[PDB]
Design an enzyme around this catalytic site. Structure first.
Site, PDB file in Angstrom:
ATOM      1  N   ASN A 116      -5.748   5.492   7.486  1.00 38.47           N
ATOM      2  CA  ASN A 116      -5.476   4.642   6.339  1.00 38.47           C
ATOM      3  C   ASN A 116      -4.755   5.332   5.188  1.00 38.47           C
ATOM      4  OD1 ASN A 116      -6.369   3.171   3.650  1.00 38.47           O
ATOM      5  ND2 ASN A 116      -6.572   1.692   5.323  1.00 38.47           N
ATOM      6  N   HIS A 127      -3.412  -6.312  -3.908  1.00 36.56           N
ATOM      7  CA  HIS A 127      -3.390  -7.356  -2.882  1.00 36.56           C
ATOM      8  C   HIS A 127      -3.673  -8.800  -3.287  1.00 36.56           C
ATOM      9  CE1 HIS A 127      -4.033  -3.901   0.241  1.00 36.56           C
ATOM     10  NE2 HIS A 127      -3.023  -3.691  -0.583  1.00 36.56           N
ATOM     11  N   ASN A 130     -11.517   5.707   3.005  1.00 38.70           N
ATOM     12  CA  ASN A 130     -10.283   5.121   2.522  1.00 38.70           C
ATOM     13  C   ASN A 130      -9.361   6.067   1.766  1.00 38.70           C
ATOM     14  OD1 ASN A 130      -8.349   3.253   1.681  1.00 38.70           O
ATOM     15  ND2 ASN A 130      -9.868   1.607   1.605  1.00 38.70           N
ATOM     16  N   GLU A 189       0.198  -5.283   6.312  1.00 40.84           N
ATOM     17  CA  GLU A 189      -0.170  -6.619   6.757  1.00 40.84           C
ATOM     18  C   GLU A 189       0.918  -7.599   7.200  1.00 40.84           C
ATOM     19  OE1 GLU A 189      -3.374  -6.250   3.519  1.00 40.84           O
ATOM     20  OE2 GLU A 189      -4.298  -7.728   4.858  1.00 40.84           O
ATOM     21  N   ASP A 221     -10.535   2.404  -3.175  1.00 36.35           N
ATOM     22  CA  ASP A 221      -9.455   2.291  -2.211  1.00 36.35           C
ATOM     23  C   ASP A 221      -8.616   3.562  -2.348  1.00 36.35           C
ATOM     24  OD1 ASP A 221      -7.338   1.464  -0.529  1.00 36.35           O
ATOM     25  OD2 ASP A 221      -7.643  -0.636  -1.072  1.00 36.35           O
ATOM     26  N   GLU A 225       0.800  -1.213   0.000  1.00 38.91           N
ATOM     27  CA  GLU A 225       0.000   0.000   0.000  1.00 38.91           C
ATOM     28  C   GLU A 225       0.836   1.267   0.000  1.00 38.91           C
ATOM     29  OE1 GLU A 225      -2.617   1.952   0.146  1.00 38.91           O
ATOM     30  OE2 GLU A 225      -4.386   1.009   1.042  1.00 38.91           O
TER      31      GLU A 225
END
Ligand code: CA
Ligand code: CA
Length: 312
Positions: free
Chosen positions: A118, A285, A173, A35, A227, A19
Site C-alpha cells: 500500500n 477520497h 498503511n 481505484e 492512512d 493516493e
C-alpha cells in the site's frame, strides 16, 4: 488539542482513490489512482500532474499477465529518476517516467509469495520499508487485512532482498522513517488504520527492526484512521486521519497529537511535501481530489533529495 485551519487550494480532480502523492528528482508531481476499474476488474493508474494547469496524464496502467494493478503508494528513487510503487495487486513496482514498469518480486527472501503493498518509505540508506495490507499478489484472489490480521511489513534492501520484517497487522498503511540529525535511520513508524494506532520499531540496521511499540494514538471512532504520513523538517509526524476531516500532527515523541489540521473534506488519504517548501499536497477520497496547503515549515528531505556523493 489545538486545531489550525490553513487555506486549502485545489490542485486537480477526478482521480479514483487519489493516493501516493510524490515529487520526482525534476520536481514533477505524481499521483496514483488505485481505484480505477474496467468492467469490475482493477485497472489502477499512475499519473503525472501538471501543477500549473491541473491537467492529468496517465503514464502507466500496470498489468501483469492480465492482472490490473492497484497502485497505492509512491517513493522516488535517488540514484535514478524512477518511482517505486506499492501496488495492492502487483506488490512492489518500479515505474519509469516514460511510463514503463517492472514488477520487483513475486516472492519474498524466504520463498513466500509476495503480498500486495500500500505505501512505502525510503530511509537515507536506500532501504525501502513497505506496508503490505493485502493478501497474496495476483494471480491470487484479492484480499485485504481490514478485518483479519494478515497484513505484513517488508524491507526491500539495497542488495535487492525483499525481506518480510513483521506480520499480523490489521491493515498496515502509512509508513515513515525517522532519522538522526546525522542522517542515520533509527525509528520506523507504521500506521495500522482500523485500530487507530501508530506503531514504532527501532531500526537496528537494514531490514532489522526490534522493540515493536504502540507509538501514537489516532483520534476518533469513525471508520478509517491513520492512512498516509510524512515527517516535517523538525521530525513532527503528519498523518492523514481518514474519515476524521483532519491530518494529525505528532511531536517527535508521539503519543497523542500535539495539533490537528482541519481539512475542508472528511477523507484525507495521503500527503507529500513539495521539495524546499512548506507546501503539502493532500489526496482525499471524498471528492477523489488533490489539494495543497501551507504547513508551518519545510518537509523532511525525502531519500530522492539526498546526495549519494554529498560531502556533508
Ligand atoms: Ca495508503
Ligand atoms: Ca508522502
Amino acid at each position: 488539542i489545538p486545531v489550525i485551519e490553513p487555506l486549502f487550494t485545489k490542485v486537480t480532480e477526478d482521480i479514483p482513490g487519489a493516493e501516493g502523492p510524490v515529487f520526482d528528482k525534476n520536481g514533477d508531481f505524481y499521483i496514483v489512482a488505485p481505484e480505477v476499474e474496467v468492467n469490475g476488474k482493477p485497472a489502477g493508474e499512475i499519473l503525472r500532474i501538471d501543477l500549473k494547469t491541473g491537467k492529468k496524464t496517465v503514464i502507466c496502467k500496470p498489468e501483469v499477465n492480465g492482472y490490473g494493478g492497484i497502485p497505492a503508494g509512491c517513493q522516488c528513487d535517488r540514484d535514478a529518476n524512477q518511482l517505486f510503487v506499492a501496488d495492492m495487486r502487483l506488490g512492489l513496482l518500479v515505474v519509469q517516467t516514460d511510463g514503463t514498469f517492472e514488477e520487483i518480486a513475486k516472492k519474498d527472501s524466504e520463498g513466500r509469495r509476495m503480498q500486495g503493498c500500500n505505501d512505502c518509505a525510503f530511509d537515507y540508506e536506500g532501504n525501502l520499508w513497505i506496508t503490505a495490507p493485502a493478501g497474496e499478489v495476483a494471480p491470487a484472489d484479492y484480499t485485504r487485512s481490514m478485518q483479519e490480521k494478515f497484513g505484513s511489513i517488508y524491507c526491500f534492501t539495497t542488495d535487492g532482498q525483499m525481506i518480510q520484517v513483521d506480520t499480523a497487522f490489521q491493515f498496515p498503511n502509512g509508513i515513515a522513517v525517522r532519522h538522526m540529525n546525522d542522517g542515520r535511520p533509527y525509528q520506523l513508524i507504521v500506521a495500522e488504520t482500523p485500530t487507530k494506532k501508530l506503531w514504532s520499531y527501532d531500526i537496528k540496521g537494514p531490514a532489522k527492526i526490534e522493540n515493536k511499540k504502540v507509538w501514537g494514538h489516532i483520534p476518533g471512532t469513525h471508520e478509517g484512521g491513520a492512512d498516509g504520513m510524512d515527517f516535517d523538517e523538525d521530525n513532527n509526524l503528519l498523518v492523514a486521519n481518514f474519515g476524521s476531516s483532519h491530518i494529525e500532527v505528532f511531536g517527535p515523541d508521539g503519543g497523542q497529537p500535539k495539533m490537528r489540521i482541519r481539512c475542508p473534506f472528511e477523507k484525507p488519504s495521503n500527503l507529500h511535501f513539495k521539495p524546499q517548501t512548506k507546501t503539502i499536497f493532500v489526496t482525499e477520497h471524498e471528492n477523489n481530489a488533490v489539494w495543497k496547503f501551507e504547513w508551518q515549515r519545510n518537509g523532511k528531505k525525502q531519500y530522492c533529495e539526498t546526495l549519494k556523493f554529498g560531502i556533508f
